[PDB]
Design a protein around this ligand. Structure first.
Ligand code: HEM
Ligand code: HEM
Ligand code: HEM
Ligand code: HEM
Lengths: 142, 141, 142, 141
């Protein structure tokens, strides 16, 4: 559950996110900082350096899709379990991602937004985004 | 285990924190009390409110300890031996809470030092903060 | 979800558990092996040695209550969320136990049953108990 | 950090495992494949069935490595340097899975060695297995 003021502060900041960049930045950071995550993305080519990972065209294009799903989550913030139902099955049945990795990606996203927005990512906006990213991760766990 | 390159990344980024370290420590504590409100049960006799002087002074203690741990990155279990005693024996702080404060420090550094906070530096800072959290919990009974 | 064969194997072994001992053994082992858990039990007196912890009369009496709740869970194994509803609030509102500690106690219980039953705690009976103890821990998390 | 008493507990209990160590290793793998079936995706070309000879021989490799790590408990990061390379660089095994195998080893030892598996020994074995899991993951990129 989020307060009206939280829902508003969340929405106002997301409107200012670059949807072409922020998701690949977040996914590139997960493969650099938590390198066992690269086991799931071995078809994306070379991931053998921070700079290889952050310039991979396949990492950029997949981060777009993940940021899109986070966006779909923010539009449906009172019904996350039903929003992410199909995707939950996709990360469990086909290829099992441990549910602790969803928590790691959401914290990486919070760092990428802090990095972008600076002194506008205030301790209260972070507290609202943490509620959102925990929401998404629990919704995605099977 | 910290690489010589991790040690260089950590030393260079924490060098830029410099004389803003007490301020960064107190913002990290404020972020943690706000986002992760269960963490407030370890500080039952503290005024934990915006602009609080008890949190400003604790933020400064935390950041001095990290400045010390960067200076002694090779012998941290020795340099942090008395903190390890306090957190594991006297305070019995649950290890999950060290991950929460580590996140809040990285968020603070990302918001203040955007040009220093590259993916390589992010990975080195995460390793350093996990290694500090390791020593501070490595005790208990 | 558990198979009929799992439900049966679980029930047959629990019938042979000493309800006066196994719960204090499990709770005593959590305070020895994961000592930050002692922060929640500081009214139970002395806990400063494995032998102090395992002879504390207050640890034995509280392990009886926890084993009783696990027993209530096994009787209602298809409705754990509603069985443990009141207890979930009790471990969150009054005194916040992180939900990862519930996972640690359930694994300690699995070790105590293995210790007691020997070559009768076969790899299949353990797999059924692991499903039960994960059930209880997710039911208890707020 | 392992106490001299942890080192004594670990050395004495693993001493009693003795010539039953390959057998205990294979029971630990069987328990993990049964209870935690996601762990089976690291072994896609193994016959992972009851009484399997591929699992009997792997159980023996795992237990030899622990016998080595008990013998070199002071210098485990050195003794386990090539295992750390294989698990973190080549296999990219997620750290959660090391906790699962550690649990299955403790359950095996509790079921086989009930008089040795006291609360003090339980606590020392948990510390030792977490320290082995630390070295085997301490690498990665
Ligand atoms: C927690 C937030 C996450 C979200 C919102 C998310 C979202 C998505 C979406 C939208 C897709 C594309 C679905 C499709 O077009 O069929 C996808 C695919 C995938 N995700 Fe995630 N994901 C998340 C976390 C993770 C994590 C933590 C991992 C593993 C470390 C992971 C691994 C994958 C993989 C392997 C694919 C398939 C890639 C391919 O072969 O094309 N995801 N995810
Ligand atoms: C990087 C991690 C941390 C560092 C470097 C750190 C450092 C310190 C320092 C330097 C002290 C005070 C020592 C003194 O003045 O004698 C302290 C005290 C304390 N810390 Fe931490 N700490 C960390 C994590 C945590 C966490 C995660 C918690 C709990 C959520 C916590 C709770 C406390 C408490 C309750 C005190 C005592 C406060 C007082 O009354 O003065 N610490 N810590
Ligand atoms: C996961 C299975 C667990 C179960 C089934 C369980 C069950 C119970 C039950 C039945 C009570 C007594 C309720 C009453 O009579 O009012 C209780 C109380 C309590 N539990 Fe738990 N519990 C579990 C885990 C834990 C864990 C992991 C912790 C902390 C490490 C914990 C800390 C407490 C405390 C502090 C009390 C109150 C003790 C007192 O002051 O008397 N419990 N629990
Ligand atoms: C105490 C923990 C562990 C120890 C001591 C250990 C030890 C070993 C050893 C000695 C080898 C074989 C080395 C060789 O023959 O060259 C090995 C290989 C392997 N291990 Fe582990 N391991 C541990 C945990 C794990 C875990 C948790 C997983 C995954 C769930 C895992 C998956 C593998 C795989 C996939 C291989 C390669 C298998 C093959 O094709 O031969 N290990 N491990």
């Amino acid at each position: 559950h989020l307060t009206p003021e939280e829902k508003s502060a969340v929405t106002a900041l997301w409107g200012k996110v670059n949807v072409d960049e922020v998701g690949g930045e977040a996914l590139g950071r997960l493969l650099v900082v938590y390198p066992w995550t690269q086991r799931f993305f071995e078809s994306f080519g070379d991931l053998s350096t921070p700079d290889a990972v952050m310039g991979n065209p396949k990492v950029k294009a997949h981060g777009k899709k993940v940021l899109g799903a986070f966006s779909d989550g923010l539009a449906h913030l009172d019904n996350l379990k039903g929003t992410f139902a199909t995707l939950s099955e996709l990360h469990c049945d086909k290829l099992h991602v441990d549910p602790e990795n969803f928590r790691l990606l959401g914290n990486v996203l919070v760092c990428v937004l802090a990095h972008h927005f600076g002194k506008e990512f205030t301790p209260p906006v972070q507290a609202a985004y943490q509620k959102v990213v925990a929401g998404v991760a629990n919704a995605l766990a099977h | 285990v910290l690489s010589p390159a991790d040690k260089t990344n950590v030393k260079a980024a924490w060098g830029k924190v410099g004389a803003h370290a007490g301020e960064y420590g107190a913002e990290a504590l404020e972020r943690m009390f706000l986002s992760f409100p269960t963490t407030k049960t370890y500080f039952p006799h503290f005024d934990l409110s915006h602009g609080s002087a008890q949190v400003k002074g604790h933020g400064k203690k935390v950041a001095d300890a990290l400045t010390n741990a960067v200076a002694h990155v090779d012998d941290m279990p020795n340099a942090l031996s008395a903190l390890s005693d306090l957190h594991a024996h006297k305070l019995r702080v649950d290890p999950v809470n060290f991950k929460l404060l580590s996140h809040c420090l990285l968020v603070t550094l990302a918001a203040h030092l955007p040009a220093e906070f590259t993916p390589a530096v992010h990975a080195s800072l995460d390793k350093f903060l996990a290694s500090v959290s390791t020593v501070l919990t490595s005790k208990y009974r």
